[PDB]
Structure formats: structure tokens, C-alpha cells
């Protein structure tokens, strides 16, 4: 689950 990924994809 967690938090939305803040890094570039």
C-alpha cells in the first residue's frame, strides 16, 4: 500500500 511514489518513472 504505502504512499504515492514521489520519484520519476
Amino acid at each position, epitope marked *: 500500500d504505502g504512499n*504515492p511514489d514521489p*520519484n520519476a518513472n
Partner: antibody
Framework: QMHLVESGGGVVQPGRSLRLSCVAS????????MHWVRQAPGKGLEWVAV????????FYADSVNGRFIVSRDNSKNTLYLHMNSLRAEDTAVYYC???????????????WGQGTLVTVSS | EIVLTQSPVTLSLSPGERATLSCRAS??????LAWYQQKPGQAPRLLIY???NRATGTPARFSGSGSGTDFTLTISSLEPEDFAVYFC????????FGPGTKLDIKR
């Protein structure tokens, strides 16, 4: 080598404003979310704020939401923290930290800067 | 907020002994837990992430495990540089840290 260096800390009166900066080198700054984390004197660590790699989203700890604003200038490889409505309880060393990601994991803090000390007092 | 509690609050051991540090979350954080080391006057350093993965440069004597609410950091054969403060951190619901366990040298 990867490196983060903060600046801008100092003594600030409650109610006043202060801007912190964090300059990055040694990694691709625009690929990473960036974080602010703080540590009150002799206390533990408290996450402060996160900003998306492209600056599109910003989230804040409950204790600073609405009073602190996080921003970044990828052209300068720099992260900012705009601290308004400062209170004595905001006294802490402020660290900037990169969002460390590998494989499917993310949202850990590596590397860290050396920290900058903000002292809020009248 | 997800509260992380660390036990024992302090640990006193001799070099060469094994240290066992516990972190308990107030609700399940899956395996989204990291461990950090901090020495006086220095910034924290990432040691373990995703409960059990060693970060680059973390020596083999550091190992972590756990899931849900209960997590364990083990330091085998303590070296003098290992005596420091250790924080756990979850990233399941935003980001919170434990208050730290201080490991000092038993004399």
C-alpha cells in the same frame, strides 16, 4: 560522490519567516523526491515535508502543515523550505534527505545533509 | 499517525556481544520499515530498508527482520563504532520514526 548541504538556519523570532536551502550534487536531482526532516535538541527525528521530483505534489507533517512550504528549483539542484509562523517548538536541526528508491521500494531517506540549526526564540 | 515504539530504551553491551533492538508499530506497516544509525553531532545514516535489506555500505553484522507491527534489528559482534543511537522508521502511512534506542559501552 553524493552530497547534500543545507544552509539558512539561525535565530528567528516567533512569528517571523525563514528560508532554508539544500543544494544537491552527485546524483540526478530531478529523478528524486526530496524531504525535510528535523531533530529537536536532544530529541528524536520528525519528518517535515516531501516534494515530488517534478514539484507537482507536496505533503507535510501535521505539525507544520499550513505554516511551512516546500519548493524546489531543479535547474539549480536546490530544495527549499519556507518557514512561516514559526514557534519555539520548531527549534531543531533541519536535515534535507533524498527519497531513496530501488527496485519497487521507495520512501526511505538516503543520503542526508549535515543539517542546519534553526533556533526560534524571542 | 502510526506510532513506533522502540525497546529497550537503552542497551549496554560489551564489544563483541550481540545486540537485539525491537521496534513495534501501533498498526501494521507491512514490511515498510527502515533502520537508521546516528552518532553524536552527525546526521542519521540509512542501514536497513524494507525491514530486511542492507543499504550499500552497511556491514554484514547488521541484519533486520519483521513484518506487520513487530520488527528486530540485530547487530552481531559489536564493534566500537557501532555504539550509537538507532531509529526505526515506517513509510506505510506518511513517515514516522521511533524515539531511538541508545546503545552504550558496558564497563
Amino acid at each position: 560522490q553524493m552530497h547534500l548541504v543545507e544552509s539558512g538556519g539561525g535565530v528567528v523570532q516567533p512569528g517571523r519567516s525563514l528560508r532554508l536551502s539544500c543544494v544537491a550534487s552527485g546524483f540526478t536531482f530531478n529523478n528524486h523526491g526530496m524531504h525535510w526532516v528535523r531533530q529537536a535538541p536532544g530529541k528524536g527525528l520528525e519528518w517535515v515535508a516531501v516534494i515530488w521530483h517534478d514539484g507537482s505534489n507536496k505533503f507535510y507533517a501535521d505539525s507544520v502543515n499550513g505554516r511551512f512550504i516546500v519548493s524546489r528549483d531543479n535547474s539549480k539542484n536546490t530544495l527549499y523550505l519556507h518557514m512561516n509562523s514559526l514557534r519555539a517548538e520548531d527549534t531543531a536541526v533541519y536535515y534535507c534527505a533524498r527519497d531513496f528508491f530501488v527496485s519497487g521500494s521507495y520512501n526511505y531517506f538516503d543520503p542526508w545533509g549535515q543539517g542546519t540549526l534553526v533556533t526560534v526564540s524571542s | 499517525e502510526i506510532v513506533l515504539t522502540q525497546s529497550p530504551v537503552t542497551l549496554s553491551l560489551s564489544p563483541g556481544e550481540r545486540a537485539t533492538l525491537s521496534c513495534r508499530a501501533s498498526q501494521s506497516v507491512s514490511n515498510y520499515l527502515a533502520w537508521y544509525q546516528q552518532k553524536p553531532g552527525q546526521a542519521p545514516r540509512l542501514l536497513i530498508y524494507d525491514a530486511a535489506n542492507r543499504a550499500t555500505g552497511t556491514p554484514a553484522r547488521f541484519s533486520g527482520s519483521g513484518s506487520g507491527t513487530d520488527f528486530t534489528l540485530t547487530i552481531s559482534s559489536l564493534e566500537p563504532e557501532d555504539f550509537a543511537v538507532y531509529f526505526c522508521q515506517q513509510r506505510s502511512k506518511w513517515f514516522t520514526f521511533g524515539p531511538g534506542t541508545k546503545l552504550d559501552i558496558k564497563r
